[PDB]
């Protein structure tokens, strides 16, 4: 039954760590994709007047 | 791309220079006519 709590320990060792660290990455991806949009807009916005 | 952006300094900086110089040579043409227009107007006042 320890071995059972252990299979659960993996689930309780938190596969959600995926989701937690992922959330931190979802944030960096907005910083990144915001910037990607801005890389194309930084080019577009700086010219021509 | 940062390096592209550094290149974009110089690339747009020279276009600024380019459009400016297009006008600078166009001046030279217009100003020679400016000269005569004024010289001619005087030359006739004197003549009359």
- Phi then psi dihedrals of residue B46, to 5 deg: -65, -45
Q: Which two tokens stand for residue A5?
A: 């709590």
Spell out which chain A residues touch chain B, with contact meaning CB-CB distance below 8 angstroms.
Answer: 39, 42-43, 46-47
Q: Answer for the pair A47, B9: CB distance below 8 angstroms, yes or no.
A: no
Kindly report the three-state secondary structure assignment for every residue of B1-48. CHHHHHHHHHHHHHHHHHHHHHHHHHHHHHHHHHHHHHHHHHHHHHHC
CB A46 within 8 A of CB B8: yes
* Among candidate residues A21, A41, A22, the one with its CA nearest the CA of residue A33: A41
Joined tokens for residue B37: 């227009």
Q: Is A13 helix (H, G, I), strand (E, B) or coil?
A: coil
Rounded to the nearest angstrom, the minimum Cα separation between A19 and chain B is 32
Contact call for residues A36 and B1 (beta carbons, < 8 A): no
Experimentally determined by: cryo-EM
Is the CB of A46 less than 8 angstroms away from the CB of B8? yes
d(CA A12, CA A4): 12
Q: What span, in angstroms and rounded, lies between the C-alpha atoms of B16 and A44?
A: 17
């Amino acid at each position: 039954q320890q071995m059972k709590k252990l299979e659960e320990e993996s689930r309780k060792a938190i596969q959600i760590a995926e989701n937690s660290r992922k959330a931190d990455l979802d944030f960096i991806d907005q910083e990144l994709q915001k910037k990607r949009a801005n890389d194309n807009k930084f080019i577009a916005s700086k010219m021509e007047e | 791309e940062e390096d592209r952006d550094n290149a974009l300094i110089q690339q747009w900086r020279v276009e600024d220079t380019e459009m400016r110089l297009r006008r600078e040579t166009l001046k030279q043409k217009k100003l020679q006519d400016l000269y005569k227009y004024e010289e001619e107007n005087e030359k006739k006042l004197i003549e009359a």
